[PDB]
Design a protein around this ligand. Structure first.
Ligand SMILES: OC[C@H]1O[C@@H](O)[C@@H](O)[C@@H](O)[C@@H]1O
Ligand SMILES: OC[C@H]1O[C@@H](O)[C@@H](O)[C@@H](O)[C@@H]1O
Lengths: 858, 856
């Protein structure tokens, strides 16, 4: 009949290839173990209790040997009556990580060398009735490449040194292998050089025609119409007639149209195209700009006996607008003719072990983005291309994906074999992902050009080789990221833009400029470690990375640590800090101390760390939105985590929100007031509106003594054009304070519609550690709210950065890390299965002033 | 209703833009003078007798001012009431050379800055009933670019210095303007920095829909079927229905398919694609590999008003593969057409005139027929020229001459600014869309010699090592983007069934340019550089040879056309002006090669003939060697086919279309079945039977060793079976075996390939340079016979006569053969084609041979 597929994900065992030193050291791993597919031998070893959980305390080093070893997977499967007589029977590996040799009933069947490629092999003649034996050998990429690398004239500038000394300094095998770069350890992740059959394996069988894919190519989309072309790829083993029927369903569920096309297919590849025009399309818009409407395209193929394939897709135009203006050349994402200031963050993998990521976690990550008012995530090139399901959720929720190809910043080799291996990966990933409306941009890599131009080790490298070799290496990069990826996108996903490298100017000129293209800014946190107010002096056309570190939630810390470890410079805490080769808690202390002095205890440390991060990023993100149209994007580093540890994330490994993620919802709000005080004692006030209509609204400013008294009060009408930022005042300290003590005085700025409160920013005139913050009495009052509750908070005085917690009880909050103002109640919604009485007793309430009180000197 | 178009080519006049010093110097140019459109102001001046013909003697210099000046074209044209009532009225310029500013009824209309671009402009609101005043101002690219260039930190390497000192040394404006590189002077052509409206101008008007193009996109083609997509590009002003009908006609003009598609168009651009599958297609094949079968696709577009417009494409169904596979010689490079690996046999094609606008269809056709007649299957259209006229490509489709199409970059390092890059991208798009449906265009190529120059030419090396390394990286990046990304992407987007090639010679940016074991090669160590003996050709065997050559002078009639008796000396000022290699001192290099083989020419006419013999025989060695080496090499494109003006060059056919000896030899060394008998410098003669047939060749070959005095020394004959598409070595003979102590100065060997009694191919081998031989004194008998339209001329020599050359003074006549060897006693009949009377022909007939030329 039609094609069939059977998944070979069960019955798998695994062990060390016989003869390795690791087999003597780990004899249990020399014998067969149950193996997960999809999975990793690493997680297989963990499940079998041969090694302890590498995420817990200091166990990271105990599993490093597995990445240095060669592995042998085995399974047995049966092929039945019907299957063996089909005209085609193929084995299909969706993911082999990475250097793989596949054997079927003892005969060599496939060599593989790309974690991101799908491998399809003709199996029919080698199969048999009943028991078949499938074997997959996986070779350590470190062990494989290093002996070859040791013999080379030079090693290309790579990624991170091994903390375990199993690779030479500045001689990294990772740049020579198409494998997720973060597997080799990063500056927020452990070194887990995974080996695995990390995606599904199938037996597939078919007769006359195989349906190789469906793509809805959008040719032009506007409000009047969408002209699309449904493109069907068909493999035929012989020449014959086919009949294709295409059904098109609206977002409402209605029936838009039915379309048919007859064709004769010929042996090999065949393309059958059906044009569809939709009048007055219900287009797909990013979050905050309308509905995430989508159409469904269902095609059937009758050959000489039918077959079904379905594509859900969203109609929209995408333009990367780069227009000359007074700040140079712009960079802005334009969806359905709407210029969208990009609001979001950088997305890294969801786990050190990618095969074990649940749908729930993928969905949760995106819903977190959504709830924090983000409209774009950048999928950073040091990770892996995501699961289909992840992209489904981004389509549904309206989170735009800026999709890096998976180059993380190492300098690639220029040999043809590497290039062509990478091309086929690119083609496969672009074909896989192209029909997701959320995928609006493709980007060749993370930071390769800017590293080559600005990082000391690249600069030293490129000047130490002969200039003729430098040209070869640069020609390699230019071709890979300027031609190969660009052409794959142009061929297979032609309606979306391509970008050579982030950050860059698409190879027009140099990387990382402030008046053209995008920028990653790291002079704050990294490098000279400048004060966070320096963020106010940087304004590129698009900021695609910047950030600050903080510790995860308390619950998360207890999850990888035990009381003996509860110190910023404990061995276990050090292991969980990956920045600045293990001594990055000093950098964190630097920033914490500047604003808050010395934390009283480890609890306050975690909190202050999250405040330092949250308040720092608020400065930058607000500054950038306020600068429109000078800037048109803010993607902070980073959204998420791979493991329990310190990082730049706003949401930790267990989905727990940091203070940053709650602040993010505010500074990314559709209507926002920015009031940002610079180091010159100048406070600039702007009203920002992402609305497509005019905003008629008022704003007010109030100057307050911390003793509770009002000093001055101003209010004005405001008319803000659509999609703009309007500067509405610029106030020196003298103007705001008069002779009032800066250490005892603050300012409140609010934006209102009618008198519904849209946004608020509270301004201070000194580092918090120098303030005379009042001691707040905060009043709790609960109330049923259906399945959840309403918690109302009232403070007699200013309370800064109020943090609500419930110990180990499970409850999430509509808001947290907020300011309370004198006599002004704030109600949050508490979601929890726990009863009112238990949330009563569990509730802990922390604030800045109470936290700073009783603190030691520095 | 349906779109209408009026060509605005009549009634132009032209003059210097007022206010220039040249207006004082050339008062007649300051006044209005008739202008020809298409044309050049240069040729308008010549027609007006304001300057003498720059092709004649040393008149080149007298017209240089015109390239340094700004020009004002003007014409009046009428627009009727109906046109003004169409929904759309546009002016279209197919070609402005180059920096142009267009004005209509005194209002600025269009700025243009690319010779190779088409410019369409909305004109309707500016037009008026009755008379309209159209003006085009053209600005000298030199005068415009040089003051800017002078303020730059460096100038990019590229092109030729001005022999007239009107641009500083190694600071060339041409690099920065999109204009035919050879206009600024080249090493076989004069400096004619043309300004002109050099292609047609039209007023076009349309209502509901404008049909912007038809393209037949070949998806897959084999013997069993061709799956194609007829792609219609429709411009609409308003939303509404269209019905498209498509007729498909086979090579015999009979309908092989009929198709219908309805669609609704919307404002702007629309694509209507019709899938067509042709069962058992009659595919297009290159010359020598079958018929040049073509299908005609006729589309009719009924718009929403119910009006119909027709558009047509004649095309050829064929698969093209650039096959590059690892083998014992490295990595191959061969073009494969309809599954047949074709050894490429041909030459490099340059423009047909220094003034491309006056080239006739007749000259285009004749150029391609010459190639056909010399057994060529491929011309490379070299990037220093211009994209050719539509008609030229039609004729190539017709005759089966494949075109290797360079984009028009000739070797200069280009600047890396975005504006230049995007200007060029639009030129690429427009050219690829215009040319894509010619089956003859089988490959697109980024440029001529940019990479190999950058890597191997002293001035580029010096230049790139002199700038800051960060600047070197910026320039290299600009190149790699332009030639590696932009052009590749245009071809992939708009002509995706043909291969793209970043640069000739090269490896497509995989690695370095000009390798012997990967990609193609331009080889110039013979003629150029160290100037090696021509037998060194036997030592050079790249995977594909896409340029190489030797110079010669043009036909004596062509020489007489541009020089007078007083000028007939190779070092006369006039002959030097017409020698453009090495700053006019190329006759030194020419004499080097001539003297090496033949000694000192007797007189000037002997100099011309020996120059042609030197070139013919030298190229013979190389071309024969490359074919005999198959599959090590899989292409021979010699530099060059043709000329842009009368002068010394590497061409085999001169500016007036007169065949040189090389062209007659080319027909022999490119013959489908060929015997190669090649003696190297160590006295070893390798004999190969070369067969381009797609079937086994069952044949015999033979050899006869002869004394100059007529005696027969030895003979041997042998049956041979030659595989399809192959070269078979069938002997290697030392001088000792061939000569057996006979004097090498007094002995020759004849090699022959036969099929049955039919002689297919003959090679005559010698054992010493001609100037060392004891060539016998030949007595050549000639006898004429009427042959219907023309005449049969039978020549019979009593001794060997080498390289017999037939001519008729200034009497016109063409020959079926020339520059041939006569063997003692063996008559050769040549067909003589001529309007002239037999009486005049017999009277004018001159017979030259090598021994008599060398006899002093
Ligand atoms: O250093 C924090 C992060 O900053 C980003 O810009 C990239 O360089 C990442 O690879 C890195 O992990
Ligand atoms: O030197 C003769 C010719 O050689 C070719 O390879 C190119 O370099 C041409 O530009 C040149 O005119």
């Amino acid at each position: 009949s039609h094609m069939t597929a059977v998944t070979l994900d069960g019955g798998w065992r695994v062990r060390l290839v016989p003869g390795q030193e690791q087999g003597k050291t780990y004899p249990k791993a020399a014998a067969w173990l149950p193996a997960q597919v999809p999975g990793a031998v690493q997680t297989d070893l963990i499940a079998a209790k041969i090694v302890p959980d590498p995420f817990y305390r200091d166990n990271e080093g105990k599993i490093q040997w597995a990445g240095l070893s060669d592995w042998q997977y085995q399974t047995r499967f049966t092929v039945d009556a019907a299957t063996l007589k089909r005209e085609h029977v193929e084995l299909v590996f969706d993911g082999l990580d990475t250097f793989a040799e596949v054997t079927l009933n003892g005969k060599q069947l496939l060599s593989a060398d790309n974690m991101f490629r799908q491998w399809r092999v003709d199996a029919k003649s080698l199969l048999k009735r009943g028991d078949n034996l499938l074997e997959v050998k996986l070779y350590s990429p470190i062990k494989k490449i290093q002996p070859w690398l040791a013999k080379q004239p030079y090693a290309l500038p790579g990624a991170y040194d091994s903390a375990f000394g199993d690779e030479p300094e500045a001689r990294h095998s990772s740049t020579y292998v198409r494998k997720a770069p973060y597997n080799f350890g990063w500056d927020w992740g452990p070194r887990m050089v995974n080996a695995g059959i990390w995606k599904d394996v199938r037996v597939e069988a078919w007769d006359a025609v195989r349906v190789d894919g469906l793509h809805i190519a959008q040719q032009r989309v506007d409000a009047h119409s969408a002209q699309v072309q449904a493109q069907l790829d068909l493999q035929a083993g012989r020449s014959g007639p086919v009949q294709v029927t295409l059904d098109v369903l609206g977002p409402d569920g209605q029936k838009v149209g039915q379309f048919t096309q007859d064709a004769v297919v010929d042996p090999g590849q065949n393309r059958v195209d059906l044009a569809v025009r939709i009048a007055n399309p219900k287009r797909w818009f990013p979050a905050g700009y309308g509905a995430q409407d989508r159409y469904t395209f269902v095609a059937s193929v009758r050959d000489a006996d039918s077959q079904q394939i379905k594509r859900v897709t969203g109609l929209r135009s995408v333009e990367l607008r780069r227009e000359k203006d007074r700040f140079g050349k712009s960079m802005e994402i334009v969806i359905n003719g709407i210029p969208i200031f990009a609001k979001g963050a950088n997305l890294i993998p969801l786990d050190a072990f990618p095969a074990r990521v649940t749908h729930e976690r993928m969905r949760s990550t995106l819903q977190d983005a959504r709830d924090a008012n983000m409209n774009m995530l950048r999928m950073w090139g040091g990770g892996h291309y995501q699961d289909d399901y992840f992209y489904d959720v981004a389509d549904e929720l309206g989170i735009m994906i800026w999709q890096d190809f998976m180059f993380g910043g190492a300098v690639p080799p220029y040999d043809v074999e590497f290039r062509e291996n990478t091309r086929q990966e690119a083609i496969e990933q672009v074909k896989r992902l192209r029909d997701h409306p959320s995928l609006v941009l493709w980007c060749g890599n993370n930071e390769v050009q800017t590293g080559w131009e600005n990082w000391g080790d690249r600069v030293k490298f490129k000047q130490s080789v002969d200039p003729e070799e430098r040209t070869r290496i640069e020609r390699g990069m230019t071709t890979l990221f300027g031609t190969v990826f660009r052409e794959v996108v142009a061929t297979y996903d032609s309606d979306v833009p391509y970008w050579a490298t982030s950050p860059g100017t698409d190879f027009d000129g140099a990387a990382d400029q402030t008046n053209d293209g995008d920028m990653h800014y790291w002079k704050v946190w990294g490098g000279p470690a400048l004060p966070v107010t320096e963020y106010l002096n940087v304004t590129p056309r698009f900021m695609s990375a910047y950030g600050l570190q903080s510790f995860p939630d308390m619950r998360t810390v207890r999850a990888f640590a035990e009381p003996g470890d509860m110190d910023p410079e404990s061995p276990v805490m050090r292991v969980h800090q990956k920045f600045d080769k293990g001594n990055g808690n000093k950098r964190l202390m630097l920033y914490i101390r500047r604003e808050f002095g010395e934390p009283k205890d480890f609890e306050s440390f975690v909190y202050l760390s999250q405040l330092m991060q949250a308040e720092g990023i608020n400065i930058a993100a607000s500054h950038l939105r306020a600068s429109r149209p000078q800037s048109m994007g803010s993607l902070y580093w980073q959204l998420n985590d791979v493991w329990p540890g310190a990082s730049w994330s706003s949401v930790d490994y267990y989905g727990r929100w940091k203070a940053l993620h709650y602040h993010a919802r505010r500074f990314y709000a559709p209507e926002m007031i920015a009031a940002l005080r610079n180091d010159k004692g100048q406070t600039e006030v702007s009203l920002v509106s992402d609305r497509t209509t005019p905003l008629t609204a008022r704003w007010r400013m109030r100057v307050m003594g911390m003793d509770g008294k009002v000093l001055s009060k101003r209010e004005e009408k405001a008319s803000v054009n659509a999609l703009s930022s309007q500067h509405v005042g610029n106030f020196s300290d003298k103007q705001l304070l008069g002779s009032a003590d800066p250490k005892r005085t603050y300012a409140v700025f609010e934006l209102l519609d009618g008198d519904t409160l849209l946004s608020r920013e509270v301004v201070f005139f000194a580092p918090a550690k120098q303030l005379a913050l009042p001691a707040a009495k905060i009043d709790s009052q609960w109330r049923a709210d259906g399945d959840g509750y309403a918690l109302t908070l009232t403070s007699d005085t200013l309370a800064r950065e109020v943090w609500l917690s419930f110990g180990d009880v499970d409850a999430t909050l509509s808001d947290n890390a907020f300011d309370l103002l004198p006599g002004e109640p704030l109600t949050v919604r508490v979601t929890s299965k726990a009863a009112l009485a238990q949330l009563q007793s569990a509730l802990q309430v922390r604030d800045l002033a109470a936290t700073l009180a009783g603190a030691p000197p520095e």
